[PDB]
Design a protein around this ligand. Structure first.
Ligand SMILES: CCCCCCCCCCCCCCCC(=O)O
Ligand SMILES: CCCCCCCCCCCCCCCC(=O)O
Ligand SMILES: CCCCCCCCCCCCCCCC(=O)O
Ligand SMILES: CCCCCCCCCCCCCCCC(=O)O
Ligand SMILES: CCCCCCCCCCCCCCCC(=O)O
Ligand SMILES: CCCCCCCCCCCCCCCC(=O)O
Ligand SMILES: CCCCCCCCCCCCCCCC(=O)O
Length: 581
């Protein structure tokens, strides 16, 4: 097109356009005040309309990167506020855009965003909807300069829906707060998935990611032929690499192109893409990436004929090893939408090892004969862990389950700080609440999806302040052995018990007025501290102390003159508990 500004403006619409321009500037000029970004947006938008009325008007022929860089270099305080970044303005466009990219601050020093009171939010939202929503969109964007813009917009619209609905309800807070919590959770989850997947693309190279994409794309598109899944894997690897580099426009064009291709070849790929492919370009790739798995073909043979009994397995494997393993993965994954991607990768890995050991042995066709028998245990491992853990979650509530995990992982890595054990145990509990309500046929993908974020959050924390050599080993391992590495952690039989500190086990009547959430975190904190002090306590002993404590709390929150109850009965509870252990 003669005018990229005009074409993007027509295709996106005025509203999406303004929001995206705001996110972009917010991500590059992370320290300018909101009203500055508003003025930049309005100026750019006005220019855009000029180009929509006539693509030949001056400057409309310029590229997007040139116009963006020009507006950046129009900020008069650029050198005072950003220093080096102002030097990018001396370069010509190919180098200028890259320089700006590099000078994005992934960790700016900005005060933590305070969630105001529900009445304050609803009042501002009603009295000034667009400034209320846009200011927050800027506050979020400036704190995630590498978060993909369009997805941030997709979140923003869900925030708008949350306020439009809840600020009319009688119990506003009961409506909104859970929704704001969900949005926050998905936001940090996604924002960490991005960083994780790029760090894997850099650490382990294109091949491993290609493997992953074969598995997931095959579960999603079982009716597609291998050549098509392979074409999509190559294009998807390109998209991810480019998006991990950072350029918004390049990444967007790559995703839009892939979406166009997938929508023109629906019959070759999937039958559940009908509506996604009718959505506007802004939502297309997003919709296609979230679509449910396609129904798998009914009359699918077993893999025995192609990958075991057939002669030429070694010939077809040495001919193009990665293509062959890709074919094995493809056939296996499209047959098992129930398996996790990582599990399929342990299968493909195992099959690769044995094909390596057997095609060089006396008789290959006999060495690799009973290979699929090797898959069974690797498959039953996550299955048994799911059955047992969801079975435990059905017995105990979410909270008591959290306490079970708390005791197990505290005994496993007692060197981890207390608040981190509490937060990991509670998060794992939430994963149990969410996935255990699916049937078995759909539980393992769920767990993986959630575990990858939880075990990810742990690892970043552990990187900043390392404590356990075993946890470091699990965090530096390949993303396929990460979860198994954590499951392999054993109780630390070398840990020296922590010194008894009376205050750690002293309780005051304020606990009676705390919210259920803060009361829970207080008791769970004391429970971790209790296991760290008496790490060798047995399940029954621990239950006895916890029972004593629970009854003690309900007695002192029910008594006249509560503080003396907590101090007296507190002394008795502690003495008795030390004696029992
Ligand atoms: C539209 C931009 C999003 C507005 C979000 C308002 C809530 C801010 C608090 C963030 C949180 O509590 O998670
Ligand atoms: C369409 C071809 C894609 C290439 C497929 C290669 C399959 C390799 C299978 C081994 C598992 C790969 C998992 C990554 C970890 C590793 O490097 O070992
Ligand atoms: C003068 C222009 C400055 C910058 C303009 C804002 C950039 C807008 C381009 C982003 C459009 C995203 C297209 C859809 C994304 C996707 O399908 O993946
Ligand atoms: C990064 C996605 C951009 C749009 C192209 C994807 C459309 C094909 C659907 C396959 C998506 C599978 C799940 C996400 C893949 C990924 O980004 O790693
Ligand atoms: C589900 C309950 C979650 C409770 C925490 C422990 C989960 C253990 C089973 C997770 C299964 C992992 C699936 C992905 C994989 O490693 O193959
Ligand atoms: C920063 C250090 C964090 C260390 C946290 C220690 C607790 C590890 C949590 C392990 C969860 C993985 C669950 C896999 C299934 C299993 O329980 O075996
Ligand atoms: C040394 C012994 C110290 C004695 C204090 C007892 C520790 C209490 C902390 C665990 C609380 C467990 C939660 C009980 C509940 O479900 O309400």
């Amino acid at each position: 097109h003669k005018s990229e500004v005009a074409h993007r403006f027509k295709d996106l619409g005025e509203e999406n356009f303004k929001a995206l321009v705001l996110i972009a500037f917010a991500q590059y000029l992370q320290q300018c005040p909101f009203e500055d970004h508003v003025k930049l947006v309005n100026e750019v938008t006005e220019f855009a309309k000029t180009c929509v009325a006539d693509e030949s008007a001056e400057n409309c022929d310029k590229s997007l990167h040139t116009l963006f860089g020009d507006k950046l270099c129009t900020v008069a305080t650029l050198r005072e506020t950003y220093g080096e970044m102002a030097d990018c303005c001396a370069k010509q466009e190919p180098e200028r855009n890259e320089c700006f990219l590099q000078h994005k601050d992934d960790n700016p020093n900005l005060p933590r965003l305070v969630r105001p009171e529900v009445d304050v939010m609803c009042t501002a939202f009603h009295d000034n909807e667009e400034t209320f929503l846009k200011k927050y969109l800027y506050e979020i964007a400036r704190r995630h300069p590498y978060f993909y813009a369009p997805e941030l917009l997709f979140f923003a619209k869900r925030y708008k829906a949350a306020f439009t609905e809840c600020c009319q309800a009688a119990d506003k807070a009961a409506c909104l707060l859970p929704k704001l919590d969900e949005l926050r959770d998905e936001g940090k989850a996604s924002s960490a998935k991005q960083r994780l997947k790029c760090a894997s693309l850099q650490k382990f190279g294109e091949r491993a990611f290609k493997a992953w994409a074969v598995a997931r794309l095959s579960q999603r598109f079982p009716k597609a032929e291998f050549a098509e899944v392979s074409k999509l894997v190559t294009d998807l690897t390109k998209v991810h690499t480019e998006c991990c580099h950072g350029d918004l426009l390049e990444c967007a064009d790559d995703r839009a192109d892939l979406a166009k291709y997938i929508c023109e070849n629906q019959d070759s790929i999937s039958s559940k893409l009908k509506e996604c492919c009718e959505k506007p370009l802004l939502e297309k790739s997003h919709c296609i990436a979230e679509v449910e798995n396609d129904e798998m073909p009914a009359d699918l043979p077993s893999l025995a004929a192609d990958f075991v009994e057939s002669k030429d397995v070694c010939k077809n494997y040495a001919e193009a090893k990665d293509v062959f393993l890709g074919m094995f993965l493809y056939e296996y994954a499209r047959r098992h939408p129930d398996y996790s991607v990582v599990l399929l990768l342990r299968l493909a890995k195992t099959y690769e090892t044995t094909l390596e050991k057997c095609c060089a042995a006396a008789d290959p066709h006999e060495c690799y004969a009973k290979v699929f028998d090797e898959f069974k245990p690797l498959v039953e491992e996550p299955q048994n862990l799911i059955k047992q853990n969801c079975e435990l979650f059905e017995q105990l509530g979410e909270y008591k389950f959290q306490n079970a995990l708390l005791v197990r992982y505290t005994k496993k890595v007692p060197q981890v700080s207390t608040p981190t054990l509490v937060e990991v145990s509670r998060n794992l509990g939430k994963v149990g609440s969410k996935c255990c309500k699916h049937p078995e046929a759909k539980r393992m993908p769920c767990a993986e999806d959630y575990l990858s974020v939880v075990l990810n959050q742990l690892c970043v924390l552990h990187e900043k302040t390392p404590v356990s050599d075993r946890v470091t080993k699990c965090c530096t391992e390949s993303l396929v052995n990460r979860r198994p590495c954590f499951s392999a952690l054993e109780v630390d039989e070398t840990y020296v018990p922590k010194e008894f500190n009376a205050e750690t086990f002293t309780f005051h009547a304020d606990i009676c007025t705390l919210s259920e959430k803060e009361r829970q975190i207080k008791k769970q904190t004391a429970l971790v501290e209790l296991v760290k002090h008496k790490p060798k306590a047995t399940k029954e002993q621990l239950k006895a102390v916890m029972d004593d404590f629970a009854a003690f709390v309900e007695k002192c929150c029910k008594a006249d003159d509560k503080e003396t109850c907590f101090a007296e009965e507190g002394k008795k509870l502690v003495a008795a508990s030390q004696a029992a252990l």
